From TrEMBL, chain B:
Keywords noted in UniProt: Protease inhibitor, Serine protease inhibitor
Spans through the membrane: none
Similarity section: Belongs to the protease inhibitor I13 (potato type I serine protease inhibitor) family.
Task performed by this protein: Inhibits both subtilisin and chymotrypsin.
Origin species: Hordeum vulgare (Barley)
Shown segment, full-protein numbering: 22 to 84 of 84
Protein name: Chymotrypsin inhibitor 2
One MF term in the entry's GO annotations: serine-type endopeptidase inhibitor activity
Length: 281, 64
């Protein structure tokens, strides 16, 4: 039997599934450590590796990209977990080495590959404390080209009145996502600041792991793909909506939580986002 | 619980490893170049050490 992780229910993804919408024909790039394509609860449609010495994007020797991908798009069947957008076309864009680090140029090349291959959504469950002009230009180009770009806000927690949102989440063109638990409380590690945009579940999130396994992880890494998957659901229901419209629909229909410095606009609600008229609940 | 070590910035990666392992003997320590991008999972058992090209600590070490 399949299980629906609590976070998929919490963002109201099952309301889209019941309407018949599951992210069909929507192309989502998981720009990350690869995706294990042999996992029976994932279907990987394509991809590419930007890591010079690790040329297979369908081998995930880290485990992180596979977990992120299952939250986006684990298959709807009788096994494992169910993803937010279980019919999405999933692309493994490997930009992190097995050791769990990537050069800025590799992430940029992955973003460029996504643009060149007409991805509808990019998820980046990744970050660093500094920007670069080249990084900002790549995310700005993707958004100018029509791609919905979603990233983890960072796991820096608080630091008085300072923003702790990392890059590329901190760029205006990217939707920066923080983490809440099942009671809608901000996780203590979740980055904060005026750049925090929306929140999604990121505590004890069950998903797919390499070698046909499953497991619960924590992080703004886990929160980001709920939002990338929600963007795919919305596009499958409204295939002409632009990235601008998909972004506004998620922002304009959150359930407001606390102060925006800690919670941004609150928890996404993809049921409300995917209606024509938007308001907060 | 001690979970950040701002006093280690500018020290050698060797001294940072020793000090972190005194405070947190079960820590999983990972050394990476400063200015790289890393995945955003939060692991209470892990301490990343970001080093400059001289192998000195270039960012406050913290659990995560
Ligand atoms: Ca399944
Ligand atoms: Na942003």
């Amino acid at each position: 039997a399949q299980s629906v992780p609590y976070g998929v229910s919490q963002i109201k993804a099952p309301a889209l599934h019941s309407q018949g919408y599951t992210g069909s024909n929507v192309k989502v790039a998981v720009i990350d450590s690869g995706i294990d394509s042999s996992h029976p609860d994932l279907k990987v449609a394509g991809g590419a590796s930007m890591v010079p010495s690790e040329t297979n994007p369908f081998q995930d020797n880290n485990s992180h990209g596979t977990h992120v991908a299952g939250t986006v798009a684990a298959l709807n069947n009788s096994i494992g977990v169910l993803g937010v957008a279980p019919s999405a076309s999933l692309y493994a864009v490997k930009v992190l080495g097995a050791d769990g680090s990537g050069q800025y140029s590799w992430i940029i090349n992955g973003i460029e590959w996504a643009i060149a291959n007409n991805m509808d959504v990019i998820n980046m469950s990744l970050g660093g404390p500094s920007g670069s002009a080249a990084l900002k230009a790549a995310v700005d180009k993707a958004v100018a080209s029509g791609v919905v770009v979603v990233a983890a806000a960072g796991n820096e927690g608080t630091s008085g009145s300072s923003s702790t949102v990392g890059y590329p989440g901190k760029y205006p063109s990217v939707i920066a996502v923080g983490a809440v638990d099942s009671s809608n409380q901000r996780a203590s590690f979740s980055s904060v600041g005026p750049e925090l945009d929306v929140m999604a579940p990121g505590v004890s999130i069950q998903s797919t792991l390499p070698g046909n396994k499953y497991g619960a992880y924590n992080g703004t890494s886990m929160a980001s793909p709920h939002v990338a998957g929600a963007a795919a659901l919305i596009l499958s229901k409204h295939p002409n909506w632009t990235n601008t419209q998909v972004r506004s629909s998620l922002e304009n229909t959150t359930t407001k939580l606390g102060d925006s410095f800690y919670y941004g606009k609150g928890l996404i609600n993809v049921q409300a986002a995917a209606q024509h008229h938007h308001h907060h609940h | 619980m001690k979970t950040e070590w701002p006093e280690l910035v500018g020290k050698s990666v060797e001294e940072a490893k020793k000090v972190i392992l005194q405070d947190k003997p079960a820590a999983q320590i990972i050394v990476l170049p400063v200015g790289t991008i890393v995945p955003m999972e939060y692991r209470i058992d892990r301490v990343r050490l970001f080093v400059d090209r001289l192998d000195n600590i270039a960012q406050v070490p913290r659990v995560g």
